[PDB]
Amino acid sequence: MIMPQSRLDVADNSGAREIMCIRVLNSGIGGKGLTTGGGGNKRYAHVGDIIVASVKDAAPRGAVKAGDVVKAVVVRTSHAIKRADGSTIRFDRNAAVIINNQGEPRGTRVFGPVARELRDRRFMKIVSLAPEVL
């Protein structure tokens, strides 16, 4: 799963290449904006969970920079997620999508496939720019 110290890849053109998980929010997207934490614990973030993260390396020229403290929403965990039919998906690398306090990507596009779990999590816009939704 994902947890503080866990570096995820960035699947958007936000400008940040790699981010380090600073904290695990309890993914509150809903109602008006993003909702606030469902508890102060919760140790692992799963595809679809929102986390707070620090930026470890960003590309030269791009909205986001090295050091920025941002919010990303986990789209590909190297962990297995178990869809209800009983099937299991698992990507070769953890990777996330940086976002804003509305849950919209900071980037103009998403790279690589995205866990289809983000669709139930209601992150439609993310699903929107997804090349694929495995």
Partner 1 sequence: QTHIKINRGELLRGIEQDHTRQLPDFRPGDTVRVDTKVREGNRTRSQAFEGVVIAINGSGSRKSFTVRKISFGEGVERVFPFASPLVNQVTIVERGKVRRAKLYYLRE
Partner 2 sequence: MKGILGTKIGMTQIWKNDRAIPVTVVLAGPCPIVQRKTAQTDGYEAVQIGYAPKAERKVNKPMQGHFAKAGVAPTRILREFRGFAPDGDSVNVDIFAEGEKIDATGTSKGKGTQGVMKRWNFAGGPASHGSKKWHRRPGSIGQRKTPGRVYKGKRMAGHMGMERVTVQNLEVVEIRAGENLILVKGAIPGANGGLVVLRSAAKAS
CB distance 118 to 98 below 8 Å: no
Q: Rule CB under 8 A: is residue 92 a binding residue for partner 2?
A: no
Q: How far is the CB of 37 from partner 1 (least distance, A)?
A: 28
- Taking the C-alpha atoms of residue 120 and residue 108, their distance in angstroms, rounded to an integer, is 22
**By C-beta, is 86 or 132 nearer to RNA?**
86
Integer Cα distance of 97 and 54 in angstroms: 13
Of 78, 73, 11, nearest to 48 (Cα)? 73
Element (DSSP H or E) covering residue 54: strand 50-58
The only residue of 60, 85, 101, 132 in contact with partner 2, by rule CB under 8 A: 85
Question: Closest approach of Cβ 88 to RNA, in Å?
Answer: 4
Write out the residues near RNA by the rule CB under 7 A. Answer: 1-7, 20, 22-23, 25-26, 28, 30-32, 35-44, 52, 54-56, 66-67, 69, 71, 77-80, 82, 86, 88, 94
Give yes or no for residue 109 binding partner 1 (CB under 8 A). no
Q: Examine residue 120 and tell whether it contacts partner 2 (CB under 8 A).
A: no
Cβ nearer to RNA, comparing 75 with 129:
75
| Distance separating alpha carbons of residues 106 and 126, to the nearest angstrom | 10
Q: Please calculate the CA angle 121-127-130 and round it to the nearest 5 degrees.
A: 145
**37 touches partner 1 by CB under 8 A:** no
Residues at the interface with partner 2 (CB under 8 A): 84-86
